[PDB]
Subunit: 31 residues, 4 copies
């Protein structure tokens, strides 16, 4: 049930944040 991941690095977070965002978009076009 969900997995919280704390990232101390601001850059690293931005990366995963971009992947998480693009991942959610794929779901919209992949049910």
């Amino acid at each position: 049930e969900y997995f919280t991941l704390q990232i101390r690095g601001r850059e690293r977070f931005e990366m995963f944040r971009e992947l998480n965002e693009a991942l959610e978009l794929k779901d919209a076009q992949a049910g």
Copy 2:
């Protein structure tokens, strides 16, 4: 500065989880 990012993806999270642990190891060598 830590950042909590909740993700509902076992694979997606596993990715960032490996990228976070891999990025921390590189710091030990880098400067």
Copy 3:
């Protein structure tokens, strides 16, 4: 602008393959 990247990891490649297709999708929606 192209950069041929050769890797001996079927798993690692599969990852970037998903990230590549996910990046093109998010880029198409944005501008």
Copy 4:
């Protein structure tokens, strides 16, 4: 074993380039 992945992005490539180099380093620690 090899998998040539043609990338058409300087940023995207830089990402996989860091993930590829970071993955190879893990092999030295884990095996």
